[PDB]
Amino acid sequence: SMKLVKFRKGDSVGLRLAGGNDVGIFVAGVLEDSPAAKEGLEEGDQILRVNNVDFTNIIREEAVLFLLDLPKGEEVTILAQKKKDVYRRIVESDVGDSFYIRTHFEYEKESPYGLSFNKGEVFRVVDTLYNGKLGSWLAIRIGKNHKEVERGIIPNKNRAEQLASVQYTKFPAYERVVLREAGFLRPVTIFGPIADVAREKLAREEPDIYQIAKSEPRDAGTDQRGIIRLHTIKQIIDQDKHALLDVTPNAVDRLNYAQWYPIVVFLNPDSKQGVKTMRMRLCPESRKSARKLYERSHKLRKNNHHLFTTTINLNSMNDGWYGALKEAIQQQQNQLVWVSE
């Protein structure tokens, strides 16, 4: 049975909140005498709606700030319901919040209970008011095989967006993500010292599935080696074919932002000599230095590994990498992708 209470606010609404978006916001306690205590509200009640706002799927931090932000002297209306069956079992288990975020900045733990991260890591956030205060989020790291590897504290979004500003992407510090299946053929970026051979090879031998996207003209005073437009890519997606892209790491990030999440394959070199041996076998004409090509891929892995979707280790002695690339691409295509909510 529902309760609908109506009262004026004085200094505070006079409530302590538990739960979160995965279970509901529950009344953890009432300050005595208060107009909210007067109108019936008590421990164990789920807050369903406040004023004109739905509280059934709001994160705990957001609910606290909303009740804080309410003007004193003015009228508050609350839909609630006694659900002691569930509030009691919000105490046995941690359960409160549950949603996923992607990090778009580097953070180093400020405590041994903290969690460090690089760009692109994903987290299940389980508590938006660690220790009943604002400042930290309790969260679980998600990496390989989508498994919960580690649990610990991180900054709340407010501090995060602020910690991230000391790096001036179009991305927010924390973005809300969720798992989806690609309803289209994902563009394919290939990095490493065999990428150019791989792009040409895939397009040449398997033109039915793959297509190279044409580069725009070269910008004056660059390196003498052009960006690709969203229109050029979209038009290739428009005919159930994988767009092969020769683009920079940042273009990949802009592509991630425009929700086109390309399959990003890094072909990891064997050695300097192994690169030459593969060069001699696959493109004996090419004038590109095996030295530079090897240093480029290490520098690129050094600074942009977060953008890698998959990795294939090159064995100079064979061209098994090709067959492995074909399979890696189709594998990635059928994978769930963490997508902006």
């Binding site: 505070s12 609404v13 006079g14 409530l15 302590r16 909140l17 538990a18 953890a28 306690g29 300050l31 705990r60 606290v64 009740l67 804080l68 919000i90 105490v91 941690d94 409160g96 508590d127 008011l129 220790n131 009943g132 205060k133 309790l138 649990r151």
Partner: peptide, 10 residues
């Protein structure tokens, strides 16, 4: 370890 703990008084 890691109990939820009620919010402050709002």
């Amino acid at each position: 370890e890691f109990k939820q703990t009620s919010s402050f008084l709002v």
